[PDB]
């Protein structure tokens, strides 16, 4: 990317960000847009902003978000969003300290050296002004065999040290948060249950429930209570949601009749557009009653001769249900596979009744398909990186000469199109990845979400970083590789290649934090949909919650994006140490914006008690792995022996991973028998702990 | 190795084997050598051989060893030696089926081809008759780009299939054996105890025992019984064994006095050789009584202000002690690390009181030291492989010309010296490896033994195979690599190199099974030591057991050797498919000999209930990994594209490892809550379950 395209993209993103901030500052203090700007404070009866009269100083949302403790977030949102905020805080601290040391000593060294302007004379491009004024401040203006590479090696060394320190402190802190939240938890149904799964069939005349009982009733006498057999109820769920659909439609028809004093009309055809006309109220009433009768018959008939191989088993104490979830129940780890029962809000009832070979086959095939689509998205990654360097792509396939003649078209294409394409592809990714993760037999929503995050991290790393960087290198160097000496191909490739991808990543990250956080704070897209789904034909009856329900923070899409930006900022923290500023800005603005949203907008849908965060630590340290490796390659592709001194860094990163896994990881999987025994329950009902898991 | 040296080594080994078999056949049926040939049947009051009169047909030890069921071995020896026998049986079956298919179709193909005699004319050694008549029956007589390589690829494919099938069947069978042995076990002290380890210190006025209690007394009320704090008692053990030494010495003095009616005399100096003379009985008596008083004082004073951080905690039920060993007890996996308590015969009381960072540091440093000594034994591996090819080592360092002129000296050196050196080094290995394994903080003898076996497997694989093979290649090819084309260096190296190491391995394996099993059945070394420690000055008093106690099967030295021979036989099952015969003979003779020894000689010292065998399966499949890789390299160093078709074999070997780990491994670590609940105890004493763990 040239300097003109970079400046145009920055200007457009900043202008849009300012416009959206002005829209947010105006709309958010209007009483009309209270359901859409303070949904987490109006769904809880909490007086959206403070009680006094005309107030709400434009910059008041920054005073309540910057002065909110981490206990306020846990109390108001949950210990699962405070984990997101400690993730953001520790990434921001890593990049802040790294910038503080890196930038004042690595930017002058790159700027004052002259490898560029000495590689345009030796290679004699004549002219090919590909290098921009922004590429001088990168590890491509550094000459071969230079003492400044010592400062760059010290820089990667210090980034590794800072990352280790902050990861250790964060992982201690998250362990403390989880231990505090678990110890003070109330009586919840998921603390008394286990997920018995992969059970055999009764080889006699005996129902599955009678087999689950008299089996745990002999292992756990006087401490085992009941069991829900995971009955296959797909069609039951379908019929019940269809019944609920006609219940809501009849409520809408009644509201319309009350409003207009006239009987509404309905069409019996598809989607009520083309078909025979019938009265809404009578048809909906009779269809509702027939559906009620048919649903009752189906619910009665669910218990059938077919045998289901999954269950939820409830114990009378927290200790028994916590100890009898980490134990082995049969001397064949196939049968009676027992884990902690997820929340009733988190069970994937469809993913139960899947045996061990089935799960393993599904996992392997899904992983193979993920690799295949890794390649299939590596193709459009090549397209995007090709579009970024549009001027250098005039020499290849010179058919594009007529369009790339005038600066305006080339500038707008370079500054907008690749980012939009990358956003489109990486936005189609999350839904497919979450669907694939749920298809492995994973029995909880949190585990499925974090597995989708892991698959998206594989996508991010390989496709985004490696594909975009390598494609930038090739489209920037292949046509200039006419001679093939190994002494000249390496330096030409490296120097004239990598910081170009670095600059494109600056542009992409700036686009992300500016326009994304503008669209998130201003919230116009959910505000345009609202006030339009309300005043037009939709939203006839009250049904207040359904129209403006905020929803989850969507860690299946948020954390993958934050971690992609993390990976990028670890990419060019040393190669082009201007990504550090953009990463700091991204994560600081993310802190501010997401703090405002979590305090006031988003409401969580499940509580994993910070279980996600070890995955985050694993992936951050995986980025550190990858880019200690990248520094290993680069320092050495500059043809001087700084390669050796990074091997201890890679080895100590692996050792740090093992040590952190050994010292804190095991406390995240389970709840200890200290938060379970001495939590001093108050004689739990055990009856609404049961049937809090029942789907109906 | 030439053919003459190979024949001389085989003849010497077979002659020694026949001599030792004749000695065994004569000595073992003499009533005098009953304690030394039937110790596992005289220590149990079992009438060493059958009750009748003059009998014991020379070939009767083969009728009782070939017609002994696997339940007889479990009843008489244990379910831990039946695991060794299923290991031997499955390796023998793998190699038997592989020979059955391999040999009739791979030996004629190698014999009828003429790559050799076409590589001595192209390279024009003139003359360098390095190739022996035994190298024609190997994958070095196969020409480049030949259709016989298709049969060789099918051969490695079929070996992989047979190994997968036999590993699956064996691992099912061992799971069944363990489930049968655990379910029928009696009341043992290790089923009611857990090993609480890595505990904090009481930060107040409170003893460690009072801290262990009132902690598990709140997690486990009415199901927790007592706790042994792992008091540091090194000097207590030293003083007690010193007291026992003088007790035995006084018993010996009393026996001598009774025998000769004279008072024995003792020297107060070092080892009683030089020093002042004193009466034995009076001095030993007064020293015994002072030691008794001092031991009582020390035992009283053991409980001190210093705080010990390990314990053994006893529960009142098998279920509680089995469920409260897989659970997490504190929400910090540092503190209160709990595992299943090993047997009282298996606890390493010194390795307790070691915290998590200490254990991790010790593990990492010990692994680094193991790699360092891997290299330091790679040096003598090079020496051994250099001595094997003595004739080719005349061209290098030609100073050895005078000694290598006459066939006799060269033949005897080649046929004896390398094998003796390899045996000496690989025999010094086990003690060091077992000492290192115990220094990692491992709390049981079985785990330490199997960790030493793993380290020895690393030694075996890397040093023995890779070092010996590569050194044979280099000493056989470096002086003949005058030109450096890649088209000719590869084929020369491969073909004229690998089967030489193969032949040396034939010789080594033959030496092993012949002379080792002759010395094991004949048992002359323990029989020369006996009958000499008895009739000479030693063994004055009765003390029958101490003189001829057979001891454990020593899996720390046996299984590593069997697995080294396993690795070798997987080496040259295809490259030189004559190793298959030697491996079959080794493992069949091992079956017979070790069956006779386990039925009649060796008595186990601990019972791990087949816990070792997953390590064996892991290592067998690791050999399959390594040599699917070796076939991948070799088929392709023959310069035709059979490389690709082995990648699915490597991938499916990894997948098979994961699947076997998933389906059976978890049942070996713990005892299920089916063999613990419904085992129907009979009101265990719980008092001799306690203090069965007390060292004194
Ligand atoms: C240490 C490295 C471990 C690597 C293991 C790979 C692996 O596990 O495959 C599977 C993974 C996906 O697992 P997950 O959903 O994130 O697991 C969630 C986990 N339970 C958690 O708690 O979070 O990942 C996948 O499902 C996809 C794996 C395909 C990898 C694609 C490779 C690209 C090919 C091109 C690369 C060229 C090579 C250079
Ligand atoms: C002068 C020209 C101005 C050019 C304007 C450029 C607009 C860029 C829009 C960027 C939008 C963006 O940043 O993400 C918007 C989304 C991606 O959401 P996410 O980051 O994964 O997380 C939030 C998630 N959606 C959630 O629900 O929590 O992204 C999507 O899901 C869909 C992306 C489609 C973008 C199409 C833009 C319109 C084309 C350009 C319009 C300009 C016309 C003139
Ligand atoms: C260097 C530090 C490496 C740190 C990681 C260690 C590693 O790679 O694997 C670790 C293994 C451990 O073996 P084990 O104790 O027998 O396992 C016991 C286990 N519980 C069991 O059931 O059995 O392996 C070991 O810890 C034993 C030694 C590890 C290193 C092996 C030497 C590598 C050879 C290098 C020379 C190559 C030249 C050619
Ligand atoms: C000139 C011609 C000489 C003709 C005679 C050749 C004698 C060969 C002696 C080799 C002995 C031999 O093969 O192994 C002898 C033993 C067995 O082997 P292992 O695998 O370690 O088994 C360990 C088993 N678990 C155990 O009980 O231990 O190995 C051991 O466990 C101990 C190894 C000590 C090595 C001592 C060998 C000295 C050679 C003596 C030279 C003979 C001079 C004449």
């Amino acid at each position: 990317m040239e300097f003109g395209s970079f400046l145009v993209s920055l200007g457009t993103s900043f202008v849009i960000f300012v416009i959206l901030m002005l829209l947010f500052t105006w709309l958010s203090r209007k009483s009309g847009n209270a359901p859409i700007y303070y949904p987490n404070r109006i769904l809880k009866g909490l007086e959206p902003w403070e009680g006094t009269s005309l107030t709400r100083n434009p910059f008041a949302w920054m005073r309540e978000a910057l002065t909110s403790s981490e206990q306020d977030v846990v109390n108001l949102s949950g210990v699962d969003t405070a984990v997101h905020f400690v993730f953001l805080s520790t990434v921001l601290g890593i990049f802040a300290c790294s910038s503080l040391l890196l930038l004042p000593t690595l930017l002058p060294l790159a700027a004052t050296d002259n490898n560029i302007k000495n590689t345009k004379n030796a290679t004699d491009t004549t002219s090919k002004g590909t290098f921009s004024q922004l590429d001088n401040l990168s590890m491509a203006n550094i000459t071969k065999k230079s003492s400044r590479l010592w400062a760059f090696l010290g820089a990667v060394y210090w980034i590794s040290l800072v990352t280790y320190f902050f990861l250790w402190k964060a992982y201690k802190h998250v362990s403390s948060l989880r231990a505090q939240a678990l110890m003070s938890a109330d009586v919840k149904p998921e603390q008394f249950a286990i997920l018995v799964r992969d059970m055999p069939a009764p080889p006699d005349g005996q129902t599955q429930k009678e087999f689950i009982d008299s089996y745990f009733r002999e292992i756990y006498p006087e401490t085992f209570y009941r069991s829900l057999v995971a009955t296959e109820n797909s069609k039951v769920n379908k019929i019940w949601e269809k019944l609920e659909g006609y219940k809501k439609k009849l409520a809408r028809a009644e509201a319309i009749l009350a409003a207009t004093n006239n009987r509404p009309t309905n069409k019996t055809g598809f989607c009520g557009l083309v078909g025979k006309q019938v009265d809404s109220i009578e048809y909906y009433t009779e269809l509702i009653n027939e559906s009620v009768a048919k649903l009752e018959t189906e619910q009665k008939a669910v218990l059938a001769e077919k045998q289901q191989t999954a269950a939820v088993v409830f114990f009378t104490t927290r200790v028994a249900a916590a100890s009898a979830a980490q134990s082995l129940h049969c001397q064949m780890v196939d049968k009676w596979t027992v884990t902690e029962a997820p929340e009733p809000r988190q069970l994937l009832w469809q993913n139960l009744n899947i045996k061990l070979f089935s799960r393993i086959i599904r996992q392997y095939f899904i992983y193979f398909f993920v690799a295949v689509t890794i390649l299939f998205y590596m193709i459009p990654i090549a397209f995007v990186s090709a579009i970024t360097t549009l001027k250098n792509l005039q020499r290849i396939i010179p058919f594009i000469k007529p369009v790339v003649e005038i600066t305006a078209i080339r500038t707008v294409l370079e500054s907008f199109l690749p980012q939009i394409a990358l956003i489109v592809f990486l936005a189609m990714l999350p839904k497919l990845l979450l669907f694939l993760s749920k298809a492995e037999g994973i029995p909880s929503q949190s585990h499925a979400i974090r597995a989708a995050s892991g698959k998206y991290f594989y996508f991010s790393v390989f496709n985004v970083f490696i594909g975009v960087t390598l494609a930038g290198t090739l489209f920037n160097t292949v046509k200039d590789i006419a001679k093939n000496p190994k002494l000249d191909m390496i330096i030409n490739l490296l120097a004239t290649s990598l910081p170009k991808s670095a600059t494109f990543f600056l542009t992409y990250v700036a686009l992300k934090f500016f326009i994304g956080y503008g669209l998130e704070l201003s919230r116009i897209i959910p505000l345009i949909i609202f006030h339009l789904k309300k005043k037009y034909l939709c939203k006839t009856e009250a049904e207040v919650k359904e129209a403006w329900y905020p929803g989850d923070l969507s860690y299946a899409t948020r954390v993958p994006g934050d971690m992609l930006i993390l990976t990028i900022t670890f990419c060019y923290s040393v190669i082009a140490p201007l990504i550090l500023i953009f990463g700091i800005t991204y994560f600081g603005l993310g802190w501010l914006v997401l703090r405002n949203q979590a305090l006031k907008v988003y409401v969580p849908s499940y509580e994993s008690y910070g279980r996600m965060w070890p995955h985050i630590h694993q992936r951050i340290l995986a980025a550190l792995f990858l880019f200690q490796v990248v520094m290993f390659g680069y320092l050495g592709a500059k043809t001087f022996f700084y390669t050796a001194l990074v091997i201890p860094l890679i080895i100590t990163s692996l050792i740090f991973g093992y040590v952190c896994r050994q010292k804190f990881y095991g406390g995240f999987e389970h709840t200890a028998l200290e938060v379970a025994c001495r939590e001093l329950k108050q004689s739990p009902d055990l009856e609404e702990i049961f049937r809090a898991y029942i789907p109906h």
Side-chain angles (χ1 to χ4, degrees), chain A residues 153 156-157 159-161 163-164 570 620-635 643 646-654:
Chain A
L153 183 63
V156 60
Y157 184 76
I159 296 170
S160 79
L161 269 67
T163 305
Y164 297 151
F570 273 121
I620 296 186
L621 191 64
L624 206 53
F625 291 151
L626 173 58
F627 293 86
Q628 280 157 336
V629 166
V630 162
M631 271 295 88
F632 180 42
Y634 203 104
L635 284 162
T643 68
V646 187
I647 298 286
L649 273 193
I650 306 179
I651 290 182
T652 192
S653 190
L654 295 172

Short mmCIF file of all heavy atoms in Angstrom, two decimals, chain A residues 153 156-157 159-161 163-164 570 620-635 643 646-654:
data_model
loop_
_atom_site.label_atom_id
_atom_site.label_comp_id
_atom_site.label_asym_id
_atom_site.label_seq_id
_atom_site.Cartn_x
_atom_site.Cartn_y
_atom_site.Cartn_z
N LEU A 153 17.03 -7.33 18.38
CA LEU A 153 17.02 -8.58 19.15
C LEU A 153 16.73 -8.32 20.62
O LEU A 153 15.97 -9.07 21.25
CB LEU A 153 18.36 -9.30 18.98
CG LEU A 153 18.46 -10.66 19.69
CD1 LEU A 153 17.45 -11.62 19.11
CD2 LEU A 153 19.86 -11.21 19.56
N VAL A 156 12.92 -7.80 20.82
CA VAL A 156 12.10 -9.01 20.86
C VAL A 156 12.29 -9.73 22.20
O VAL A 156 11.33 -10.28 22.77
CB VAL A 156 12.38 -9.94 19.67
CG1 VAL A 156 13.82 -10.39 19.63
CG2 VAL A 156 11.48 -11.15 19.73
N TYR A 157 13.51 -9.71 22.74
CA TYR A 157 13.76 -10.29 24.05
C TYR A 157 12.89 -9.62 25.12
O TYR A 157 12.24 -10.29 25.93
CB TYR A 157 15.24 -10.15 24.38
CG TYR A 157 15.70 -10.77 25.67
CD1 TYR A 157 15.88 -12.14 25.79
CD2 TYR A 157 16.00 -9.97 26.77
CE1 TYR A 157 16.31 -12.71 26.97
CE2 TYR A 157 16.44 -10.53 27.96
CZ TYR A 157 16.59 -11.90 28.05
OH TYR A 157 17.03 -12.46 29.23
N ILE A 159 10.09 -7.83 24.66
CA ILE A 159 8.68 -8.12 24.44
C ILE A 159 8.32 -9.48 25.01
O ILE A 159 7.27 -9.65 25.64
CB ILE A 159 8.33 -8.03 22.94
CG1 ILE A 159 8.52 -6.61 22.43
CG2 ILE A 159 6.90 -8.48 22.70
CD1 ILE A 159 8.43 -6.49 20.93
N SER A 160 9.20 -10.47 24.82
CA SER A 160 8.95 -11.79 25.40
C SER A 160 8.90 -11.72 26.92
O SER A 160 8.01 -12.32 27.55
CB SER A 160 10.02 -12.77 24.94
OG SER A 160 11.22 -12.59 25.68
N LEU A 161 9.83 -11.00 27.54
CA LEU A 161 9.82 -10.87 29.00
C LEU A 161 8.53 -10.21 29.50
O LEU A 161 7.91 -10.68 30.46
CB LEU A 161 11.04 -10.08 29.48
CG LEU A 161 12.32 -10.83 29.85
CD1 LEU A 161 12.98 -11.49 28.65
CD2 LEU A 161 13.29 -9.88 30.52
N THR A 163 5.62 -10.01 28.00
CA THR A 163 4.48 -10.90 27.79
C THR A 163 4.43 -12.00 28.85
O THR A 163 3.35 -12.31 29.36
CB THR A 163 4.54 -11.51 26.39
OG1 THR A 163 4.63 -10.46 25.42
CG2 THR A 163 3.28 -12.31 26.13
N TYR A 164 5.58 -12.58 29.19
CA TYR A 164 5.60 -13.60 30.24
C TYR A 164 5.11 -13.03 31.56
O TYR A 164 4.27 -13.63 32.24
CB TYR A 164 7.01 -14.15 30.41
CG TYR A 164 7.57 -14.87 29.21
CD1 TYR A 164 8.93 -14.90 28.96
CD2 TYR A 164 6.73 -15.53 28.32
CE1 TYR A 164 9.44 -15.55 27.87
CE2 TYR A 164 7.24 -16.19 27.22
CZ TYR A 164 8.60 -16.19 27.00
OH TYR A 164 9.12 -16.84 25.91
N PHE A 570 1.50 -8.60 17.45
CA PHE A 570 2.72 -9.36 17.69
C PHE A 570 3.49 -9.62 16.40
O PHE A 570 4.70 -9.86 16.44
CB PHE A 570 2.42 -10.68 18.40
CG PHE A 570 2.37 -10.57 19.89
CD1 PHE A 570 1.24 -10.92 20.60
CD2 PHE A 570 3.49 -10.14 20.60
CE1 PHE A 570 1.20 -10.82 21.98
CE2 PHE A 570 3.46 -10.04 21.97
CZ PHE A 570 2.32 -10.38 22.66
N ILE A 620 -2.68 -16.51 23.30
CA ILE A 620 -1.71 -15.41 23.38
C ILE A 620 -0.29 -15.97 23.38
O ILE A 620 0.60 -15.48 22.68
CB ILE A 620 -1.97 -14.56 24.64
CG1 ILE A 620 -3.33 -13.87 24.56
CG2 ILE A 620 -0.87 -13.53 24.81
CD1 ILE A 620 -3.58 -12.89 25.69
N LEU A 621 -0.06 -17.03 24.17
CA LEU A 621 1.26 -17.63 24.19
C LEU A 621 1.56 -18.36 22.89
O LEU A 621 2.73 -18.51 22.52
CB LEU A 621 1.38 -18.57 25.38
CG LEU A 621 2.79 -19.06 25.68
CD1 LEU A 621 3.68 -17.90 26.06
CD2 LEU A 621 2.71 -20.05 26.79
N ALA A 622 0.53 -18.81 22.17
CA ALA A 622 0.75 -19.38 20.84
C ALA A 622 1.19 -18.31 19.86
O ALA A 622 2.04 -18.56 19.00
CB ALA A 622 -0.52 -20.06 20.35
N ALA A 623 0.63 -17.10 19.98
CA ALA A 623 1.12 -15.98 19.19
C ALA A 623 2.57 -15.67 19.54
O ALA A 623 3.39 -15.39 18.65
CB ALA A 623 0.24 -14.75 19.40
N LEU A 624 2.91 -15.72 20.83
CA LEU A 624 4.30 -15.50 21.21
C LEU A 624 5.22 -16.58 20.63
O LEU A 624 6.32 -16.27 20.15
CB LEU A 624 4.44 -15.44 22.73
CG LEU A 624 5.65 -14.62 23.17
CD1 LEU A 624 5.63 -13.25 22.51
CD2 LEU A 624 5.70 -14.50 24.66
N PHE A 625 4.79 -17.85 20.68
CA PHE A 625 5.49 -18.91 19.96
C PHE A 625 5.74 -18.51 18.52
O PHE A 625 6.89 -18.45 18.05
CB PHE A 625 4.65 -20.20 19.95
CG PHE A 625 4.50 -20.88 21.27
CD1 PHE A 625 3.37 -21.63 21.54
CD2 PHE A 625 5.49 -20.81 22.23
CE1 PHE A 625 3.21 -22.27 22.74
CE2 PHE A 625 5.34 -21.46 23.44
CZ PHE A 625 4.19 -22.19 23.69
N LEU A 626 4.65 -18.23 17.80
CA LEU A 626 4.73 -18.00 16.36
C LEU A 626 5.67 -16.85 16.05
O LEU A 626 6.38 -16.88 15.04
CB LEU A 626 3.33 -17.71 15.81
CG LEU A 626 3.26 -17.29 14.34
CD1 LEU A 626 3.87 -18.34 13.44
CD2 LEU A 626 1.83 -17.03 13.94
N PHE A 627 5.72 -15.84 16.90
CA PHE A 627 6.47 -14.69 16.44
C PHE A 627 7.84 -14.57 17.06
O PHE A 627 8.69 -13.86 16.51
CB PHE A 627 5.65 -13.42 16.63
CG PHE A 627 4.46 -13.41 15.74
CD1 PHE A 627 3.30 -14.02 16.15
CD2 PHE A 627 4.48 -12.77 14.54
CE1 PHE A 627 2.19 -14.03 15.36
CE2 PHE A 627 3.38 -12.82 13.73
CZ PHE A 627 2.23 -13.43 14.15
N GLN A 628 8.13 -15.32 18.12
CA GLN A 628 9.52 -15.66 18.38
C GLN A 628 10.09 -16.46 17.22
O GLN A 628 11.24 -16.25 16.82
CB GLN A 628 9.64 -16.43 19.70
CG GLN A 628 9.62 -15.54 20.92
CD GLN A 628 9.18 -16.28 22.17
OE1 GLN A 628 8.49 -17.29 22.09
NE2 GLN A 628 9.59 -15.77 23.32
N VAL A 629 9.28 -17.35 16.63
CA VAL A 629 9.72 -18.08 15.44
C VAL A 629 9.92 -17.12 14.26
O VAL A 629 10.88 -17.25 13.49
CB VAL A 629 8.72 -19.20 15.11
CG1 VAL A 629 8.96 -19.73 13.71
CG2 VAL A 629 8.82 -20.31 16.13
N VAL A 630 8.99 -16.18 14.08
CA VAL A 630 9.10 -15.23 12.97
C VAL A 630 10.33 -14.35 13.13
O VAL A 630 11.04 -14.07 12.15
CB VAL A 630 7.81 -14.40 12.85
CG1 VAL A 630 8.05 -13.16 12.01
CG2 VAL A 630 6.70 -15.25 12.24
N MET A 631 10.60 -13.88 14.35
CA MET A 631 11.84 -13.15 14.61
C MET A 631 13.06 -14.03 14.38
O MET A 631 14.07 -13.56 13.86
CB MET A 631 11.82 -12.61 16.04
CG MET A 631 11.21 -11.22 16.21
SD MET A 631 12.13 -9.89 15.41
CE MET A 631 11.44 -9.85 13.76
N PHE A 632 12.98 -15.30 14.76
CA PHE A 632 14.06 -16.25 14.48
C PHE A 632 14.37 -16.29 12.99
O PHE A 632 15.54 -16.26 12.58
CB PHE A 632 13.66 -17.63 15.00
CG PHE A 632 14.67 -18.70 14.77
CD1 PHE A 632 16.02 -18.48 14.98
CD2 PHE A 632 14.27 -19.96 14.35
CE1 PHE A 632 16.94 -19.49 14.77
CE2 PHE A 632 15.19 -20.96 14.13
CZ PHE A 632 16.53 -20.73 14.35
N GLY A 633 13.33 -16.37 12.16
CA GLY A 633 13.54 -16.40 10.72
C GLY A 633 14.06 -15.08 10.18
O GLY A 633 15.01 -15.05 9.38
N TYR A 634 13.46 -13.97 10.60
CA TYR A 634 13.81 -12.66 10.04
C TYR A 634 15.23 -12.26 10.43
O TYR A 634 16.03 -11.89 9.57
CB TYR A 634 12.80 -11.61 10.50
CG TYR A 634 12.72 -10.40 9.59
CD1 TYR A 634 11.65 -10.24 8.72
CD2 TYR A 634 13.69 -9.42 9.62
CE1 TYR A 634 11.56 -9.14 7.90
CE2 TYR A 634 13.61 -8.31 8.80
CZ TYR A 634 12.55 -8.18 7.94
OH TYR A 634 12.46 -7.08 7.12
N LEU A 635 15.55 -12.34 11.72
CA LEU A 635 16.92 -12.12 12.19
C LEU A 635 17.72 -13.35 11.80
O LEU A 635 17.82 -14.32 12.55
CB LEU A 635 16.93 -11.90 13.70
CG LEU A 635 16.47 -10.55 14.22
CD1 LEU A 635 16.13 -10.64 15.69
CD2 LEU A 635 17.55 -9.51 13.99
N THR A 643 20.21 -15.56 15.03
CA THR A 643 19.29 -16.69 15.07
C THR A 643 19.41 -17.46 16.38
O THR A 643 18.40 -17.84 16.97
CB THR A 643 19.57 -17.62 13.89
OG1 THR A 643 20.84 -18.26 14.08
CG2 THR A 643 19.60 -16.85 12.59
N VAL A 646 17.54 -16.47 19.83
CA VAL A 646 16.09 -16.58 19.94
C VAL A 646 15.66 -18.01 20.30
O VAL A 646 14.54 -18.20 20.80
CB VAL A 646 15.41 -16.12 18.64
CG1 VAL A 646 13.90 -16.06 18.79
CG2 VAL A 646 15.95 -14.76 18.22
N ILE A 647 16.52 -19.00 20.06
CA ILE A 647 16.19 -20.38 20.46
C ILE A 647 15.93 -20.49 21.95
O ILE A 647 14.98 -21.18 22.34
CB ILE A 647 17.27 -21.35 19.96
CG1 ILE A 647 17.34 -21.32 18.43
CG2 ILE A 647 16.99 -22.76 20.45
CD1 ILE A 647 16.19 -22.02 17.75
N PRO A 648 16.73 -19.88 22.84
CA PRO A 648 16.33 -19.88 24.26
C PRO A 648 14.99 -19.23 24.50
O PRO A 648 14.26 -19.68 25.40
CB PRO A 648 17.47 -19.10 24.94
CG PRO A 648 18.18 -18.39 23.85
CD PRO A 648 18.06 -19.29 22.67
N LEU A 649 14.62 -18.21 23.73
CA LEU A 649 13.31 -17.60 23.91
C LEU A 649 12.19 -18.56 23.53
O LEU A 649 11.18 -18.66 24.23
CB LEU A 649 13.21 -16.31 23.10
CG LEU A 649 13.71 -15.06 23.82
CD1 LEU A 649 13.27 -13.82 23.08
CD2 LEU A 649 13.23 -15.05 25.25
N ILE A 650 12.35 -19.29 22.42
CA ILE A 650 11.34 -20.27 22.04
C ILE A 650 11.24 -21.37 23.09
O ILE A 650 10.14 -21.79 23.48
CB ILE A 650 11.65 -20.84 20.64
CG1 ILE A 650 11.80 -19.72 19.62
CG2 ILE A 650 10.57 -21.81 20.21
CD1 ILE A 650 12.14 -20.19 18.23
N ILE A 651 12.39 -21.86 23.56
CA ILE A 651 12.40 -22.93 24.55
C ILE A 651 11.74 -22.47 25.84
O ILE A 651 10.94 -23.20 26.44
CB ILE A 651 13.84 -23.43 24.77
CG1 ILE A 651 14.34 -24.18 23.54
CG2 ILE A 651 13.91 -24.32 26.00
CD1 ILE A 651 15.73 -24.74 23.70
N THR A 652 12.07 -21.26 26.30
CA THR A 652 11.47 -20.77 27.53
C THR A 652 10.00 -20.42 27.35
O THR A 652 9.25 -20.47 28.32
CB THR A 652 12.22 -19.55 28.07
OG1 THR A 652 11.78 -19.27 29.40
CG2 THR A 652 11.97 -18.33 27.22
N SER A 653 9.56 -20.11 26.13
CA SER A 653 8.13 -19.93 25.90
C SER A 653 7.39 -21.25 26.04
O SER A 653 6.32 -21.31 26.67
CB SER A 653 7.89 -19.31 24.53
OG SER A 653 6.54 -18.92 24.38
N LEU A 654 7.94 -22.32 25.48
CA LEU A 654 7.34 -23.64 25.67
C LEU A 654 7.34 -24.04 27.15
O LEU A 654 6.35 -24.58 27.66
CB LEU A 654 8.08 -24.68 24.83
CG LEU A 654 8.01 -24.53 23.31
CD1 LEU A 654 8.95 -25.51 22.64
CD2 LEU A 654 6.59 -24.74 22.82
#
